[PDB]
Structures are given as structure tokens and as C-alpha cells.
Amino acid sequence: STGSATTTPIDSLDDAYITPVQIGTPAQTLNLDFDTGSSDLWVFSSETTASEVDGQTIYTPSKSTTAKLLSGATWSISYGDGSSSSGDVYTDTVSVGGLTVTGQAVESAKKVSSSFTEDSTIDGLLGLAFSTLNTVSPTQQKTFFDNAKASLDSPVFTADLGYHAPGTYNFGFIDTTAYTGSITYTAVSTKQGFWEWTSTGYAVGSGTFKSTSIDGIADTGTTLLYLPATVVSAYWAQVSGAKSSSSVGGYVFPCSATLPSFTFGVGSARIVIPGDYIDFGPISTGSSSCFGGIQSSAGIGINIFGDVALKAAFVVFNGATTPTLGFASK
Numbered sequence: 001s002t003g004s005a006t007t008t009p010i011d012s013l014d015d016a017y018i019t020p021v022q023i024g025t026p027a028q029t030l031n032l033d034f035d036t037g038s039s040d041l042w043v044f045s046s047e048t049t050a051s052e053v054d055g056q057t058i059y060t061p062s063k064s065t066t067a068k069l070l071s072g073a074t075w076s077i078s079y080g081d082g083s084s085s086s087g088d089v090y091t092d093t094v095s096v097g098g099l100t101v102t103g104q105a106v107e108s109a110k111k112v113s114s115s116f117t118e119d120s121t122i123d124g125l126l127g128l129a130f131s132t133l134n135t136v137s138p139t140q141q142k143t144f145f146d147n148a149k150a151s152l153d154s155p156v157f158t159a160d161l162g163y164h165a166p167g168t169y170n171f172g173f174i175d176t177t178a179y180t181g182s183i184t185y186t187a188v189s190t191k192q193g194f195w196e197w198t199s200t201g202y203a204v205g206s207g208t209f210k211s212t213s214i215d216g217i218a219d220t221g222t223t224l225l226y227l228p229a230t231v232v233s234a235y236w237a238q239v240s241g242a243k244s245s246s247s248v249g250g251y252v253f254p255c256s257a258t259l260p261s262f263t264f265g266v267g268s269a270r271i272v273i274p275g276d277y278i279d280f281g282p283i284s285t286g287s288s289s290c291f292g293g294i295q296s297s298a299g300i301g302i303n304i305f306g307d308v309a310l311k312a313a314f315v316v317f318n319g320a321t322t323p324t325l326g327f328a329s330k
């Protein structure tokens with residue numbers, strides 16, 4: 001089997017992408033944020049504290065003839081911004097772009113933090129990191145991809161995120177029309193639960209390429225590119241008037257600037273992120289100070305190849321017995 005679904009930016013900045021997901025019988029369609037940096041499929045629901053729902057579409061398990069309460073199971077997650085959600089668990093039929101998994105754990109939120117409440121366009125998350133990170137207790141659950149894998153024509157999914165435009169998530173096949181040249185594959189470590197790999201270096205603009213190993217994760221659920229302070233300083237040094245602002249929370253630059261591209265290595269191959277991808281707009285409405293899309297990972301503890309990086313590529317998440325990652329230009 002295979003599936004194919006369009007993923008759509010939630011706003012003009014590409015702050016996140018949402019993909020429609022069918023849950024239950026009759027289908028309930030929710031717009032989920034596909035997240036290769038976590039492993040829980042959690043949704044706004046009929047159980048969510050009413051004051052914490054502000055425009056989201058909710059999953060109502062009582063209206064699904066295939067929903068079953070996973071007795072005694074609970075879940076609780078928090079992320080690096082200090083956002084969180086928690087609740088109980090149903091199993092139900094979940095379909096993505098024509099690919100159906102029966103018996104998928106659907107984590108129904110009883111509580112969500114303010115950041116999620118305020119994002120009316122995101123109805124939940126669909127995790128695609130390794131199932132070792134799933135938070136359900138006392139019986140850990142498998143991700144959608146893990147449940148689908150053995151049914152897929154090939155044990156892969158691909159992320160083809162657009163820049164200010166829709167893109168695609170495919171399951172079970174590689175669309176050879178969606179990229180240019182070749183896919184370069186690189187090794188993955190699953191030890192932290194993530195699609196963790198090592199970039200071979202970087203370049204700023206038309207600058208010479210620096211060969212250096214940069215370990216990080218391929219994370220569709222993180223907006224920006226978080227890299228070591230040395231690398232990030234070298235980038236912003238090529239932007240007149242750019243500075244790191246502790247009051248704003250990172251590197252800012254004059255909105256009148258033209259940003260240089262950023263290149264990262266994949267083996268002997270190179271992926272170029274155009275400068276426009278690195279512009280995240282005014283720090284506040286009407287400001288002439290713009291927020292940068294490349295930021296330091298120094299307080300995080302891991303480097304994160306988020307959407308700013310991934311949207312410059314066609315990315316293969318290869319879930320074979322030894323997983324790997326593939327990158328192609330497009």
C-alpha cells in the first residue's frame with residue numbers, strides 16, 4: 001500500500017504545516033502537524049477542557065463506531081518551548097492520503113497549553129519519530145508509520161515541504177518526479193528516538209564550504225534551523241546590521257536586508273537554502289527588525305534541521321531495519 005497527502009503552511013511565514021487526517025468511522029477529518037521530532041498522535045477532542053479549545057476541529061470518539069477506549073492508558077508530553085498536552089487514549093482507524101491503519105492509538109487531549117489553544121489551525125500532532133519516544137503509559141504505543149510499515153510497498157515516508165506553498169507527505173514510495181538529480185543517503189542514529197544524522201558541513205552565501213561534522217535531527221515539527229553558535233555567527237556576520245537580541249530571543253536583522261543563502265552538506269552532496277527562506281518577518285507588527293530563520297542551538301542540547309532546512313529538499317525517511325535519511329535538491 002501507499003498514501004499521499006498535501007501539507008499546507010498554516011500562515012504566510014510557514015510557521016508550521018498541516019495535513020488532513022481521517023480518524024474514525026464515519027471519518028472525522030482533522031488537520032494535524034506531522035512531526036518527525038515526536039512520536040505521539042494527539043488531537044483536540046470532545047474531552048478537551050472547553051476553555052482550552054479556540055477554533056480547532058475536535059475528535060469525538062463517541063461518534064466513531066470503530067473507536068475503543070484503551071483502558072487505563074494515559075499520555076503526557078511537553079516540548080522545548082514549554083508547551084504541553086495530556087489526556088487519555090483511544091484506538092481507532094486512521095487514514096492519511098488513502099493509507100489506512102486500523103487500531104492506531106489516538107491520544108485524546110484533556111488538557112493543552114496556551115500555545116496550542118492559540119493556534120486555531122492545528123488540530124493536533126502526528127508523530128513520526130521512533131516509537132521509543134511515545135509517551136503512552138503504561139503500554140507504549142506505535143506511531144502511524146510503524147503501524148503502517150509492513151503494509152507499505154516500501155518502508156519509507158517522504159517529506160516535500162513547500163516554501164510559502166503546499167507540499168506533500170508520501171508513504172510507501174519515492175516519487176521520482178519530485179526532486180532533481182540524485183538522492184544522497186546518510187546514516188541515522190536512533191539512540192535518542194530521533195532521525196539523527198550528521199551533516200558534513202556548511203557554506204554561507206557564495207562562501208567556501210567548511211567541512212565539519214554537525215550532528216542534528218531531521219525535524220518537520222520545528223520551524224527554524226538551530227545550529228551551533230559558531231555556524232550561526234558566521235551566517236549572521238554576512239548580514240549588515242544583524243545582531244543577537246536577548247530581549248527578542250535570537251538573531252534579528254534589518255527588514256531592508258537581502259539575506260544570503262545557507263548550504264548544508266549531506267555526504268558529498270549540498271542542499272542550498274535560499275536567503276528568502278531565512279526571513280521570518282517583523283518581530284512585532286510594523287517593526288523594521290526581522291526575525292532570523294537560522295538560530296543558535298546552544299541552549300537546546302541538540303542541533304535541529306527544522307522546516308527552514310527541510311523545505312529546501314526532498315527528504316526520505318527510510319524506516320528499513322537499519323534506518324537512513326535521504327536528501328535531494330528539488
Ligand SMILES: O=C(CNCCc1c[nH]c2ccccc12)Nc1scc(-c2ccccc2)c1C(=O)NCc1ccccc1
Pocket residue numbers: 016033035036037038079080081083115119122219221222223299300301302304
Ligand atoms: O519537539 C520537537 C518537535 N515537536 C514540536 C512540537 C511543538 C512545540 N510547540 C509547537 C507549536 C506549534 C506546533 C508544534 C509545536 N522537536 C524538538 S527536539 C528538541 C527540542 C527542544 C528541546 C529543548 C529546547 C528547545 C527545543 C524540540 C522542540 O521543542 N522543537 C520546537 C522548538 C524549537 C525551538 C524553540 C522552541 C521549541
